[PDB]
Amino acid sequence: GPKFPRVKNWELGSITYDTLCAQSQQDGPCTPRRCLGSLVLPRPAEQLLSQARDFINQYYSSIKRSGSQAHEERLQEVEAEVASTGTYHLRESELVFGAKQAWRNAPRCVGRIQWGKLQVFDARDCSSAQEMFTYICNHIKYATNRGNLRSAITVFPQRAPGRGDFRIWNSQLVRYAGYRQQDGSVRGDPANVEITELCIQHGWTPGNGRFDVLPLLLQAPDEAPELFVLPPELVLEVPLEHPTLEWFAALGLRWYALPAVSNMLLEIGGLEFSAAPFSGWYMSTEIGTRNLCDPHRYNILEDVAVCMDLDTRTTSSLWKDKAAVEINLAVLHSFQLAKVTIVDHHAATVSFMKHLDNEQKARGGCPADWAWIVPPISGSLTPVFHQEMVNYILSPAFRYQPDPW
């Protein structure tokens, strides 16, 4: 009966209707003619006001003062401010709310059961590249918490009419270098070739390992970016060993503890926070399957399978499968041993289902990007595989933005 998408779980045989998608003010990439849901990235005045108004309405509802006098005054305040300056400012608790809602809204994040629990560092007073560095170091220190990781975001000043953006050039606060060789190949992480070369151009003296931590390239309004080396003792890393395969430690593979995305734009009520790095903790397949096994990343599957003495000349030995399992286990075992928070893809997906149930009750649905929610190994062994998902853009949101260069 209901005129909303009907959503089915094929394992349990249960049914819901997503009513939340009705709240989407923004068109994604699909049309009746063709589905483009699999593409990683598909291609202000009165406009601001209506986005602002909507966000303020969201805030007052979440504190149950919808329609109140403090609500209508806040609205009046926001429009008067836009009326005379073309922009407006968020109250502190508004920014805290907006940041959590942005995470709550991110269709590609499987970790969202944790959305209510986010330390929000307000850095809207930041006025230098040097100061961004201190802020970032403070973030890393707090979030890492010696292995006992804590979700956090640091919000730098918003985009302003006429005035240059705050930007962190690095895609993450912590990344390994990728050095382009003479024999065409790459030492380190091929994903980071461009930012590696940019750091060099701005005077970084490069190393030559597979796991050199990149310096930060930080950009304050209308200034060239400045280079900052993270102090090694701030950057917690985990050496990878295997619970039973004694030779695996000899591979000298390692990963860092803190996944901290730093190139995304946080948009709240039409305001654009171009520098707003956030971090949680890893789900083990990000490291053990994507970062270590993607053919265009570290690509270690063949090396590991040879050590395991598997038949690499034939697909039907499932050598890639056997080696991926062991690499994934090594990631889990090594983080556990080191007392550094990590979550396996089974536990993570169980918890996303619970999140889906919470949100059905709370908002009538949950935007979710199936191809990103389902893990890159053991897909149908996890319950999310059997869950249909509706995908749509709600605001506040984290969005991709062009590289500053």
Ligand X SMILES: C[C@]12CCCCC1=Nc1c(nc(N)[nH]c1=O)N2
Ligand Y SMILES: NC(=[NH2+])NCCC[C@H](N)C(=O)O
**Residue 322 in the binding site for its own copies (CB under 8 A):** yes
Binding flags for ligand X, 20-39, as an x/- string (CB under 6 A): ------------------x-
Instruction: Classify residue 270 by its DSSP letter.
Output: T
- Annotated binding-site residue? 370: no
DSSP H stretches of helix in 124-249: 129-144, 193-201
Per residue, what are the HEC states of 91-126? Answer: CHHHHHHHHHHHHHHCCCCCCHHHCCCCEEEECCCC
Contact at 8 Å (CB) between 196 and 212?
Answer: no
- Residues 328-367 touching ligand HEM, rule: CB under 6 A, are 343, 348
Interacting stretch for ligand Y, rule CB under 6 A, among 218-226, 240-248, 278-286, 312-320? 278-286
The count of residues interacting with Zn ion (CB under 5 A) is 3
Token pair 């940019």: residue:
198
- Annotated binding-site residue? 35: yes
* List 126, 281, 293, 366, catalytic entry: 281
Q: What is the SS3 assignment for 155?
A: strand
What single-letter amino acid sits at 237? E
Question: Of 284, 278, 291, whose CA–CA distance to 375 is shortest?
Answer: 284
Interacting stretch for its own copies, rule CB under 8 A, among 38-46, 121-129, 153-161, 213-221? 38-46
- Annotated binding-site residue? 291: yes
Q: What is the SS3 assignment for 325?
A: helix
Sign of CA dihedral 323, 324, 328, 331: positive
Which phi and psi angles does 36 have, rounded to 5°? -120, 20
- Annotated binding-site residue? 372: yes
Contact at 8 Å (CB) between 233 and 337?
Answer: no
Calpha distance 392→198 (Å, rounded): 35
Question: Of 41, 89, 39, whose CA–CA distance to 401 is shortest?
Answer: 41
**Closer residue to ligand Y (CB): 213 or 220:** 213
> Residue 286 Cβ, how far from ligand Y at the closest point, in Å?
4
> Residue 355 Cβ, how far from its own copies at the closest point, in Å?
17
- Annotated binding-site residue? 282: yes
**Residue 93 in the binding site for its own copies (CB under 8 A):** no
> Residue 231 Cβ, how far from ligand Y at the closest point, in Å?
21
Contact at 8 Å (CB) between 392 and 46?
Answer: no
> Residue 53 Cβ, how far from its own copies at the closest point, in Å?
20
Q: Which residues have CB under 8 Å from 310's CB, separation 6+?
A: 317, 319, 322, 323
**Closer residue to its own copies (CB): 120 or 389:** 389
Among residues 363, 385, 393, 401, the one that binds ligand X under rule CB under 6 A: 385
**Residue 108 in the binding site for ligand HEM (CB under 6 A):** yes
Interacting stretch for ligand HEM, rule CB under 6 A, among 111-119, 161-169, 173-181, 291-299? 111-119
The count of residues interacting with ligand HEM (CB under 6 A) is 21
- Annotated binding-site residue? 371: yes
Q: Roughly how many angstroms between the first and final C-alpha of the chain, as a whole number?
A: 51
**Residue 32 in the binding site for its own copies (CB under 8 A):** yes
**Closer residue to ligand Y (CB): 225 or 259:** 259
- Annotated binding-site residue? 211: no
Interacting stretch for Zn ion, rule CB under 5 A, among 28-36, 204-212, 214-222, 328-336? 28-36
Q: Tell me which residues are annotated as active site.
A: 109, 112, 281, 286
The residues binding ligand Y (CB under 6 A) are 111, 172, 259, 261, 280, 282-283, 286, 290-291
